[model samples]
Every structure is written in C-alpha cells, then in structure tokens.
Target: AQTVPYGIPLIKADKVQAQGFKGANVKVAVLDTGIQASHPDLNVVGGASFVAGEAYNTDGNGHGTHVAGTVAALDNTTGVLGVAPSVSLYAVKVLNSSGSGSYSGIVSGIEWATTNGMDVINMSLGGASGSTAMKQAVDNAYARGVVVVAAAGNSGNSGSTNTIGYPAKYDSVIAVGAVDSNSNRASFSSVGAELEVMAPGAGVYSTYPTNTYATLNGTXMASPHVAGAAALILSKHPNLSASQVRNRLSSTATYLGSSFYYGKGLINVEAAAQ
Candidate 1:
C-alpha cells in the first residue's frame, strides 16, 4: 500500500517503535496456520503444529506468515516492519494448509501456549461455532497470565451488529474488529458487545510466503495489531497482569463512533505503551 504500511499510521506503531519499545523481551505466540521458518525478516523462537503430520514452522497457507509478520517482522533496512519487531514470536500452528482446522486443534494450541510461558497469544482465525472446551482453554490461558487476543471474525452485515465468533467471544480473550485507513469500521468485521477494540485491517501490508510481501484485508489483520500492542505494554511493564494489560489497551484507545462496532475504539499502541 502506501509507504511504510498504512497500519503504522492508523495505530501509530511507528511512533511507538521510535520510543524504543519494540516488544523487547516479550514472548508472543501466534496460533494460526504456520510460519515460514526461513523468512529472513522475522525472529521465530520456536513453534508447534496441532495438525497431524505437518511441520509447525512451515506456512504453506501463507496466512500464518502474514499474521506473524504483522506482529514481529524484523526492523531492518529492507522489507516491512512489524508492530513489535523485537518480540520473540512462536508459531502455534492450529490450522491446516487449507486454512481450516478442528476446534480440538485450536484448544490444543491454546493449552500449549499456556504451558510454554507465552505472555501473549494471537488467534487470527475463527468460526461460527462456539465450544465450551475452547472457552476453557482461553480462560485457562488468562488465568495463567497470558494475554489472549483474537479476531472478532469477518462475517457481518455492513454497519450492523453481529455476534463475535468462537474464542473471541470468550470473556478472557480480547476481541478485535477491523477498521479502514479512515478509522471507519470494516464492513466484514464482526461487531458485538464482546468486541474489545478495532485496528487497521484493510489492505494491510506484511511479509508473505516465498520471501515476498502481500496486502490482505480481514479482521485477521486487525487482531495482530492488538497483539503487538499488548506485547508493547508487557515489554514496558513486565509485571502487569493480563487483565491490567487488557484494560490499558481499552482505556487508552481512541473512541471512534460506536461501542458495538468500534469497541473501546481503534487501538492506540503508542499511548497504551506509554
């Protein structure tokens, strides 16, 4: 898209990075398809795949690489920069190559993250179905002080309230919706009282498979922005509780239009980190 990526403008991640907190010492686990382990512009600490017979560090579907780049692509002279460039990123591959996986696999991923000392977990995938098992997994992670961030889902009527899907609907998880460059709610971004915040999602630029970059549009793109913001908060205040970090983000957000559509508002990463 535009120079330096439009999300940097919408969330002010550039300013946050300039302040010298690029999620240093923070551990973020991305629960998605997978990640391309050999990508030069990323710092992947480790990874695991819930899908049977699949490698955890290989992003065959391309979605995981894009999401991971948004959270922690290296801050270098070339390629795009991430919201939290210095954070330690892990690939928790819950989804398969087709961009789909069972709810059981997602639960498994969450449980693994909870045990892996992950301070923040980002889930950019969701479905219409809700499961008590999934809720328990997310709640357990929160109880262990893991900041859980999830996409609010991209299935909704334009300018209308819609139910947030899956783990995002869980109380312990921060549900994130999508906004455009103008800070307007994305038409496909699911809306509900559970939505904790929104972020720039339309045409967001980030790393892709095969050592390339791509622009994608979805609530999936928005969730990682908040994930990176959460990392920033933790990087600055390492002792903050998951609840404290979550509240910091909501309290510091820029209230836009409506609670149902915008939640607390668009995420202000710099303000939250401060």
Candidate 2:
C-alpha cells in the first residue's frame, strides 16, 4: 500500500483514459497554521486540516502562509520570491486558530504526509516539549524518504543557553537556526547540540495573506528556507537518501564559528547545488 521516495503504484488507468497523468510532481507540505490557498503566489495542490472545524486552505493565523511563501511562492515577478519556487505545495494545517495544536494533530499531519508521498515536510511550529509519539512520526516519515525540517525555536540568549525545541530536536528532523543578512546568528535563534544548520531568518521578505507580502523573522521562517534549498537539491539529486541529502547540504555550507549556534554553518544553496 506504500512506497518510498515518491512511490509508484500499479498502473490501472488505461493510457487513453488518463489524460492528466504525465508524471508526478515534487510535493511539499507546510504543517503550520494552514495556508491561504487563494494566494496567487502559491500553488496549493491539496491538503488536509487536523484542526477542528477549520479548513486546510485557510490561513487564519497567517504564519503558515508566510512559511509556505518562503518554501514555494512561485517564480513570477512583482511579488516576493521563494527558496524553491514552483514546488508543489500542500497545506497540512496541524496548528489551528491560535497557531497551536495538540500532539495528535502534529502526528496525524506527519502520517498524512508520509502515506501520501510528500517529498518534504516543513514544520515552522513546535513547542519546547518533547513526545515519543512525535519522534516516532518523524522517524517514520524520514524512513519513507520525506525530508523533515523544523525550527530550533526562538528562545535563546547570547547563544549560551540551550533552547532547542521538540520535533526539531528529534534526530529524524534537521533542526534549523536563524541568521540575519550579515550571516550573523539571530539573537533569538535557538542553539543546541542538535542544531543542524543556520539559514536566512531575520527580516526575510516573502508572500503573505490577502495577496500581499511581508518581511518576517524567526527560526520558523528559517526552517522553510532550508527545506526550500533541500527541495532544489532533491530536484537534481532525487534518489539521494534522506541522510545523504542532509550531508550534501552540510558539506557545502559556509562554516561559521560554534556548532551549537550555526550547526553546519550558513547553508549556501549555490554551493550546495554543485
């Protein structure tokens, strides 16, 4: 019933009847506060809502759509750009009206992404708490060939204290910290031994609700940038194992000081593409 790295099932539809089928698309899901499907810059192929009574296509909290824009806001001009524009986007709304949800909601979202054959999962939301079930879901998704990227949290002070959060803290997910335009670590970017990489986070500009754009900041924003970069790398290197993909990015990053603060250092997608 399932397979890895974009699984293919037994062909049942006759070639003459299947007019819309050519090849599969690279699918990515933003599991946050949900995404605004009506945003012209976005291409929400499809998604589901784990939140009660709220549709997956609505971005009532606005953060999910912002996160989505950074991941794949399309390549058109006149609006903000994305890290991996043209990616097939899916809005898995785990977080609800308050931008928060239960562990069950998060796990269901992961299982959905895993079973549905998502290429990537961008988790721009998570708390400081950890759950075994959360780790299990991520592990399953990773084993299924989905690249899981998450924020390392914004709770940090001078990079001394460990502020890594759950899900991101899990080994199956690549935890991302934040750095500003100067390539310096964002003061609010969380640091820890498990921190995997640092990407552009502070004051990053991207699309938002109501067909507008905004400059937002946080490890939340940074996670999608790393995921976006991975999507591009995967586009070329599609068969790379999940860990291999992670290592590729790690090998090409610009090494800064301190692993806890910058992990593998700032991710240079240009260098990584090579």
Candidate 3:
C-alpha cells in the first residue's frame, strides 16, 4: 500500500471507548483497492482483485487498506484500534492499483459481498457514472438489510452546501462527509443534500502497507469514521438488522439541525451506544 491515512481519530474514539462492544463476530466487508493483511491492525480474511493482472486483493493503492483499518483493524498494543477490532474483515477489491475503477467492478463487488455473507459494505470509492447495475446492486443489498456506506467526495468549497457525489448520492446508500475534531466540515469535503452524516475524516490515521503508517485527508478518509462507528454499534446490537442499525445511528446522530456538510451532524458514539 502507498501513503494514506493509517489510524482512527483519537478525540472521537474517546466518546465511545467506554462502550466496549468487543466487536466479536461482526463482519465488515471493505470494498476498495484492498487491505494489507500483514499490517498488525488489519487482518485480511478474504478478498479478490478486480484489477487487471493483479489477481488478488492486495492494495497497491493505500486508500482501501487504510479505510479497512479504520473500520475493523485489529486492536493490538501498537498503533490504534478500530471500532470492531475483533470483527472479521472481508476485503473486496473493486478499484485498480491506481486507486480507481469502473462501475461494473464496483457493482460486482457489492453483489459478491452480499452473497458472500458480509453484513456491511464500506464503499470508499465512487465516480460520476451511476450505472443501473450499480444502483441495482446497492438496492439489492439494502433490501437484504446489508449496510452500504460511501464517501461524499472531496470538493469541499462551500460551507455545508448541499452537493453530493455518486454512490453516496444514491438514495439507498448512507453518504458520509468529513469533519474535524471541532465538528467543522473539512475544507475539501464535498457537501450537499446527499450527505447523511459526518465523521472524523480530516487527518485520520489508519493502517498502511509494508508494515508502516500514514495520515491522510479526503472525504474518502472521512467515510470510514462512520463505518467504524457503525461497526461499534453493530457489535453491541448483533440482532439489529442493517436498517435497524441505520435508524439507531440517525436517531442518535448529534443533530445540529441540517447542513449539506454535516448532514445529520457529527456522529455521537455516546448516543449510538445506548
């Protein structure tokens, strides 16, 4: 994996550290370039490469690896821990080594995750091409009670303006935007009506490849913040379906009214825990 965020938010984790779900058996399927199984924090259970000739889901680009770590990295003495450290991590590599892929591959990845028994799909990649295949895959997953989370893009120029990106723009998906510790929207975070929630994406830390770490900035980085939170919530409420988990999160969301940037507002782990 290359350079990208390699840990979780220290400030935000404090709010939920007491929850102590333990993340046992919660399966979080990461759909991105891929993750590094060797990383102490990231335990790769199973994944395949959609990239040409790569033939496996070993993140050539660090985005997916980092995002996976943020969601369910192993909780060891060194480095940070994820919301669901004890959960199983399923890697689904849709994007190429360059950190980008087409709608077809992404659609297939979603279908795979759903059919393969993944409870949640953390999609950190998306583009302008909103193909019907992609929509159908997402719809199918949602109908089956599989959680789908995506990035809101990194075009943050407006102060909470209502502009969203693909995948996240889809009605069935939970669109996430980036927010700093101050609860302010990241300057480069994409904003719009599609923004469903805010998370600690700005300057997030997570796992990287070659046994190293890095800090990154992007709406992509921000999405997993919520995904990790979602993992924690699911860990406690194992019987809760994906839709139920979404409702719990929305209900517990730290609402500062509505803003294109904050969406439901900064996610409060305290409220979601109970």
Candidate 4:
C-alpha cells in the first residue's frame, strides 16, 4: 500500500492481529456515474441506473468506477485493494456519462436502495441546494438502518455555502471532506458544519475504467474511504445500527491538526474497531 488516505490504523493489525475484515454479506450502494462491473477489482454484484431510462449503471466516465473500486474492489491480489475489499458493491447510477444528474433521479435511487435492503450508500455527488423530497428519502433510508455517506462537494467555496444541497447539506447524512497525507483539508474540499470527517482524497490511487488506474481527487474519493472503513467495522459488529456505527467511527477517529476544517480529524480504523 502506497499510503492513500491516512492508512487505516487497523492495517497494522492485518499483520499483527490478523483481523482483516471481509465485507461478507455487507452491501454498499454507490450512487454516482455507475460502476465498471466487469472490472475484476470492482466486485460489483448488481446495480440500477437511475439516470432516467438508462438500462445499466455501469461506468462510463471512469470516475464512478474509481470510487467503486476504492470502496469494494475485489480482495484478491489485484492491482490495488479497497478499504473494504471483500464487501459486496451495488452500483446505483444517478449521474450520466457526462458526470451530471437531476435531483429527482438521485431521490429515486435512494428510495430504491431503501426498498432493496441496502445497508450503506456511498453518495459521492451533490448539488448546491437541499430539497424536501431528498430529505424524506434520506430519512426513510436512515430509519431503515441504511447509512448514507456523501461527498461534502468539491466546490472550492466557503464552507458556510451550499445551504441547499440536498444530501450533503442535510444533517442526517455523513458529509465527508477531503484531505491529503499531510492531514490538511484539500483546497477543493468544501467547508461547513455539515462536514463530518476527513479521508484520503488527494492523489488517490484506484482502478479506473477500461482496465487503467488513476490518481484522482475530490471529496468524492474521500467518501468511499469512510464507506469502506464502515464496512470493516460492520463486518466485526454486524449488530450495530447505522447510528451506532457512525458514533463509534466518530469517537474512534484520529484527531487531525485542526477541527475547523477537518471536523473530528482523520478516521482511524484500527482504533475504531477497538
């Protein structure tokens, strides 16, 4: 491992404690550009394309594939391993090949995940406004024990902005911000009270579409790292509720240099599992 986000502290246990988490029956629903299901690294089980009448939720821009790989790439001795390598992935494509989508479509995807028994959802997408429809969908999922994790947004704007973004701005979801190995918030990571935690975001190394790799950036990339870490925790404590898992993750996080931008600081998986 070339040290992506603050390497999960538990990684050390992988050698010492030999307690590597296998996603096992865990399911992660990704609502982004889609996924490269055929990619050996993706480990995609199934997904739905919510971008209107699209037939599939497979990757087209490579961004979604990269995010999906980071969350649940196959655990084999492949090119790069994800945070939850063995976790099963569900591709919920809400965005199109051009990398954009409607709020309604995103809402539809969330609702679908709730009805489909999804445990966690990786929402590496957001707009500049919030909506009642989206809030209700998130509430529904949360009530159903589905953890909703979202990118805080890459808009290099002031943190106090985006008062209307449906998912990120919504207080119920975990709004992930981006940071580098230095533990500093990336310039593109949005700032605000909605910001919950930081994950490896800059120069993230992961699998891309068409059997390639990329060093991409964004809170989008950061979101999956948290998702994967959660998957690992859930693997151990399968009985933990979404809120309980979220609390454990927050309490066990490694404090970064500052809380103003980094929130509760870096996520420490090894400590979190304890």
Best by TM-score: 1
Q: Tens digit of lDDT per residue, candidate 3, span 148-266?
A: 89998887755535557788898889988887766677778787777888777777777777677777888787777677777777777777888878877777777654566578887
Clashing pairs in model 4?
5-200, 10-270, 35-59, 129-164, 129-165, 130-164, 130-165, 159-191
Each candidate's TM vs. the true structure?
0.96, 0.89, 0.91, 0.91
**Cα-based lDDT at residue 19, candidate 2:** 32
Worst 10 residues of 3 by lDDT: 2-11
Tens digits of lDDT, candidate 2, 1-274: 1111000010111120123221135688889999888988888999999999999999988899989888777655556556666688899999987878999999999999999999889998778798988999999999888889999999885536678998999999999999887778988998889999888888777778887777788999889877877777776666787788788778877889889888989886656655
Per-residue lDDT, model 1, residue 194, is 88
Q: What is the C-alpha lDDT of each candidate?
A: 0.90, 0.79, 0.75, 0.77
Q: List the pairs of residues colliding in candidate 2.
A: none
> Which residues of candidate 2, in runs, are more than 4 Å off?
1-24, 158-160
lDDT of 2 at 205: 73
Query: Lowest-lDDT window of 10 residues in candidate 4?
Result: 8-17
Looking at candidate 2, the ten consecutive residues that score lowest on lDDT are 1-10
**Cand. 1 TM to true fold:** 0.96
Worst 10 residues of 1 by lDDT: 1-10
